[PDB]
């Protein structure tokens, strides 16, 4: 029931090769030094390395993801990693793909759109479940785009 899609997990991987093979070494070693919670650049990464062709760097980094459990998954997503993890999709199965997009609005790779229908996905997934990163995703995801995703009246304390 695909009611409506905007971003993907793959989504994001086919903007980096949509973007300019130089621009993968730039970005790649712009990616080289992650910043401090970072989820979705580390991942962006393993996806650039991919765009190369050199994977044995993208499974580092993935690896430099213990947090992120979308980083591990995606070790055996793109790098191919023999599913050393279970099968078991992680809880920032989109959240990963806000977090990544949140960056490519950086490189002017992607429109925020996306950053927000993702983080969408990421909100209702989490308000569905009511996780215990809800709330902090309807911080997050505002802290970063800036817009009331979590459906607030937009006047709140």
Not at 83 to 105: I, K, N, Q
Not at 115 to 139: I, K, N, P, W
Request: negative net charge; aromatic residues 4%; hydrophobic residues 40%.
């Amino acid at each position: 029931h695909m009611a409506c899609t905007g971003p993907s997990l793959p989504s994001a991987f086919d903007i980096l090769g949509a973007a300019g093979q130089d621009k993968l070494l730039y970005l790649k070693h712009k990616l080289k030094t992650p910043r401090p919670g970072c989820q979705g650049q580390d991942l962006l990464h393993a996806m650039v390395l991919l765009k190369l062709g050199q994977e044995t760097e993208a499974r580092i980094s993935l690896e430099a993801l213990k947090a992120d459990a979308v980083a591990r998954l995606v070790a055996r997503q793109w790098a191919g990693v023999d599913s050393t993890e279970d099968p078991e999709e992680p809880p920032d199965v989109s959240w990963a793909v806000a977090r990544l997009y949140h960056l490519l609005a950086e490189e002017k790779l992607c429109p925020a759109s996306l950053r927000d229908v993702a983080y969408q996905e990421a909100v209702r997934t989490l308000s569905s479940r009511d996780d215990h990163r809800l709330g902090e995703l309807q911080d997050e995801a505002r802290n970063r785009c800036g817009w009331d995703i979590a459906g607030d009246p937009g006047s709140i304390r």
